Amino acid sequence: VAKLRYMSRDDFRVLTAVEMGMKNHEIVPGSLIASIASCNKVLRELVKHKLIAWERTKTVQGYRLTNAGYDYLALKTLSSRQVVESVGNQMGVGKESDIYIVANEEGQQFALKLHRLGRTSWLYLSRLSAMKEFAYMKALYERKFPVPKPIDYNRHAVVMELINGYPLCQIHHVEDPASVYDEAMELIVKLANHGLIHGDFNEFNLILDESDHITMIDFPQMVSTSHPNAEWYFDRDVKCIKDFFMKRFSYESELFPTFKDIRREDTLDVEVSASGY
Amino acid sequence: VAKLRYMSRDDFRVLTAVEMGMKNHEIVPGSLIASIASCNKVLRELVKHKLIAWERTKTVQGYRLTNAGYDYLALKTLSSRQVVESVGNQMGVGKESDIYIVANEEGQQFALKLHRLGSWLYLSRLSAMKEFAYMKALYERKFPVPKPIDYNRHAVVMELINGYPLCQIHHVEDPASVYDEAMELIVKLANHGLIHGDFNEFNLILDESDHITMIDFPQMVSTSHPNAEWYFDRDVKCIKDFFMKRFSYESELFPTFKDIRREDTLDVEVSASGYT
Numbered sequence A: 001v002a003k004l005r006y007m008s009r010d011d012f013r014v015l016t017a018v019e020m021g022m023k024n025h026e027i028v029p030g031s032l033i034a035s036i037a038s039c040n041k042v043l044r045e046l047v048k049h050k051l052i053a054w055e056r057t058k059t060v061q062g063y064r065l066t067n068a069g070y071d072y073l074a075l076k077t078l079s080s081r082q083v084v085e086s087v088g089n090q091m092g093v094g095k096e097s098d099i100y101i102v103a104n105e106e107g108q109q110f111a112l113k114l115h116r117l118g119r120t121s122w123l124y125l126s127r128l129s130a131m132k133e134f135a136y137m138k139a140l141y142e143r144k145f146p147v148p149k150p151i152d153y154n155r156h157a158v159v160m161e162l163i164n165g166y167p168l169c170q171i172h173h174v175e176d177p178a179s180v181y182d183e184a185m186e187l188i189v190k191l192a193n194h195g196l197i198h199g200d201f202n203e204f205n206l207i208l209d210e211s212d213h214i215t216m217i218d219f220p221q222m223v224s225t226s227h228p229n230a231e232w233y234f235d236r237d238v239k240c241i242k243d244f245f246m247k248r249f250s251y252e253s254e255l256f257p258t259f260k261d262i263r264r265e266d267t268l269d270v271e272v273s274a275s276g277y
Numbered sequence B: 001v002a003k004l005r006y007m008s009r010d011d012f013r014v015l016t017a018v019e020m021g022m023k024n025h026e027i028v029p030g031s032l033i034a035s036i037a038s039c040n041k042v043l044r045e046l047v048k049h050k051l052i053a054w055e056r057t058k059t060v061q062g063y064r065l066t067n068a069g070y071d072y073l074a075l076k077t078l079s080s081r082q083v084v085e086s087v088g089n090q091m092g093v094g095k096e097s098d099i100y101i102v103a104n105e106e107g108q109q110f111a112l113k114l115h116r117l118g119s120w121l122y123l124s125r126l127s128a129m130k131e132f133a134y135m136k137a138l139y140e141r142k143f144p145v146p147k148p149i150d151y152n153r154h155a156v157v158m159e160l161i162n163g164y165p166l167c168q169i170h171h172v173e174d175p176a177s178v179y180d181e182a183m184e185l186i187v188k189l190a191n192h193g194l195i196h197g198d199f200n201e202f203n204l205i206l207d208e209s210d211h212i213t214m215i216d217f218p219q220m221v222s223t224s225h226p227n228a229e230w231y232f233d234r235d236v237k238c239i240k241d242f243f244m245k246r247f248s249y250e251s252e253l254f255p256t257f258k259d260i261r262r263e264d265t266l267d268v269e270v271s272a273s274g275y276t
């Protein structure tokens, strides 16, 4: 679909200046912006295009970065590294993110995830979720877990292998409820067995391919199986999934896993809530 | 404009095989097709009938299904349930979707929607699913929608409304009342958590009494969506524009996304954007 959105180094480097400023200032002034920068027209155009936004408080007077701002910054960066040249449609919305089809010059198609923390908040937080995920995805990919191949990331943006499948949110019928139900329960366990309970395990965490085999997608800060309340969490993850199947597919099974089943094989909680080796 | 081509079960099994193989392989060699089924001539004929398409690239060498191929598979499957016996004339080119008149044995008429998105076979399979369930839900919540009848693959069968699409209507007795019927509907959707997303003159059918039925269940995004408003305001604009054009009607009784009294969690039940 869409090729890189032309804009001058002057727009760009200023935008970046606004990036750098927010670092040490909530609401950043043109003076600094301009200092860093090497202008005021650029600013008008940026505020025009809605790449930035300006606020006077009780005490402060200057400019912020809008998500559109950040979005670009990210894509420009990624464009540099060859990863993405072209951006298709928003496929959908995730827990607190946006997912688009993207591709590189060479024609290969990937998924771009764009973190948006602010269901109710900073761009910062979204940068750090992107991090945690990229790392989490690699751990789980190398260990032969069923997740996309994490490819690159920058800022709040995460490129990973595209999957031939629809998200479970939009699956309204399946011929083998037990099969998928089990592939899911079998995944929860494989996780715990490396020390990991997800915490917010819902339909949004699963893709189904054309052959109806599963893949995991949303990886926030997880909980360690040595967490005080590890169980409760485990309990929830399972409980949720059970409900969705019972509600969507009307599939129920008294075969739901329990904490006992967990037989630690790994220390994958090498960064997770209550690691305390 | 009645029954189409008769075919050998072999022809079908092969067609089925191509399908089966496209799950794991985009282009599928005879090897599998054969193995999947139990021959090569069959293929040649399907190619000839433009039912399938063979292709050779890089190192890849095998067959794929044509839209038409898919069409037949479906109809056959539909035949085998008495749900579709005969096929009337294509009614509209009015989306990435081809819509037809059809009838069963007893001769009752329904409308067949065939999804034409553009892998493509798959996403189209799943459009249909979404559409069915969505449409089912709305029907059951007493909305003005075609009663869904069945679906298979990229194909959805549903009640055939007795009236003409708004895009082919050049005058109405009381435009206002229609406009307000339309505006209501938009609202009532939002109130159960929904936004049609393609609400336009193509997706609204005026009946004998000038009462409105909705037909495209696509994005049908949730009101909890990031752009829930923009969608909303878009849908409204279509209507306004349409009447200040076809009918030269202009009212100031717009609905606003501000006016929205969530009464149901339909967005949730059917998952079309949305939250816990």
Ligand SMILES: *CCC(=O)Nc1ccc(-c2ncnc3ccccc23)cc1
Pocket: A091, A092, A093, A094, A095, A099, A111, A148, A160, A161, A162, A163, A164, A165, A166, A167, A168, A169, A170, A203, A204, A207, A217
């Ligand atoms: C439950 C709905 C949801 O979260 N939406 C959604 C939309 C698209 C995808 C998706 N589809 C194909 N390939 C993907 C690769 C990587 C990440 C997400 C992908 C998932 C979920």
Ligand SMILES: *CCC(=O)Nc1ccc(-c2ncnc3ccccc23)cc1
Pocket: B091, B092, B093, B094, B099, B111, B146, B159, B160, B161, B162, B163, B164, B165, B166, B167, B168, B201, B202, B203, B205, B215
């Ligand atoms: C504006 C008209 C247009 O885009 N096309 C069009 C063609 C047919 C129909 C239609 N008419 C009667 N019953 C139907 C049932 C189901 C689907 C479509 C139907 C509407 C719009």
